[PDB]
Structure 1
């Protein structure tokens, strides 16, 4: 495909986010690198407007699936890389069970040799005393399966999955994800058969960092075929 070649080695990544959650405005900048050969991602995010108004874990999914490792036999299903370098639009609605929801819109593409993910996030109907606004989520993350299906109508794909956030009391906060991706360019893209991505992430902190931030290590691999 088109983009495949662009992912052959380590690629620097830039993440920029503007969000408003219940009138709480904030910005995040993140930098790091991805290595699709191993489906590896290493990034550091910084809340540039000060203190993050929501819990970091809630933003992970929002904060570049083109870095997923696709096994040789599954390469023909790699829509993500296929849309590169022109990129794709990734839109979502994330429903927090018994709480508010997040609507996101992002553009992911190359700027020179940097892979850029620019996002706009709008959060509404959050409970002031909920797990989110209330900051009751543990600082960790689970493994999930992300289901992908082709959307021949939009020349894109539809993606759906549920994230499980651990709550400090031992309970769980569900976050239903609904996603659509469409190519930015006019060029041909790879439309896949149903399959899924298997994810794993580790959250950490930078001991020497005083700004509000998050350190993230993540591995993702395609499967189901």
Structure 2
């Protein structure tokens, strides 16, 4: 497809987010590269306003599914790359069980040769002593399946999945994700049959970085269709 050819090699990525969670305002800037041929992403995020007021793992899903590896036989189901270079709007509501919710609006598109994800995040109803504002989540990330369906009504897709964040006491903090993606351009896009993305993420720290940050290595592959 049109956008498909934009991802045959290594593509630089920029992520910029402005957030407000229970009145705690912050910004994050991320840089890295993606190689969709291997469904691979490598990025480093830096909180530019000081200390991040929520745990880094809670922001991983918000911080470019166009880098997912779609097997050749599933290429016709790749909505994400088909919307490029004009891009798409990605919106989510993330419900943290027994706690608050994040509402995000992002625009993902190319600026020159660079794939950019610009995000605005609003978080409300969090408990000051909860797992999020209380910073009780382990600095790690589990593997998950992301379920995708077509949304012919909006010429886009609807996505849903459950993320399980590990709590320091051994328990788990569920974060239910509801997502919608709609093209920015008026060009045609690929509406997919139901399928899912299999994801895995590894979080680490740059030993020489004194600013609050997160290093992320991620692999994602589309599946569910033979």
CA drift at 1:213: 0.1
2:81 partner SS: helix
Q: Aligned equivalents of 1:144 and 1:125: distance in 2?
A: 26
CA drift at 1:2: 1.1
Q: Aligned equivalents of 1:161 and 1:88: distance in 2?
A: 20
Q: Could you list the runs of 5+ residues in structure 1 that have no partner in the other structure?
A: none
2:75 partner SS: helix
Aligned positions, number: 225
Deviations 1:136-161 (A, max 9, x none): 00000000000000000000000000
Deviations 1:189-225 (A, max 9, x none): 0000000000000000000000000000000000000
CA drift at 1:170: 0.3
Alignment RMSD (CA, Å): 0.2
Deviations 1:82-135 (A, max 9, x none): 000000000000000000000000000000000000000000000000000000
- Superposed, which structure 2 residues align to 1:5-84 within 5 Å? 5-84=5-84
Q: Aligned equivalents of 1:153 and 1:15: distance in 2?
A: 29
Question: What residue is the counterpart of 2:224 in the other structure?
Answer: 224
1:149 partner SS: strand
Q: Aligned equivalents of 2:208 and 2:73: distance in 1?
A: 43
CA drift at 1:29: 0.1
Deviations 1:56-101 (A, max 9, x none): 0000000000000000000000000000000000000000000000
Q: Aligned equivalents of 2:129 and 2:28: distance in 1?
A: 24
- Structure 1 stretches of 4+ with a deviation exceeding 2 A read none
1:153 partner SS: helix
Deviations 1:167-188 (A, max 9, x none): 0000000000000000000000
TM-score (normalizing by structure 2): 0.99
TM-score (normalizing by structure 1): 1.00
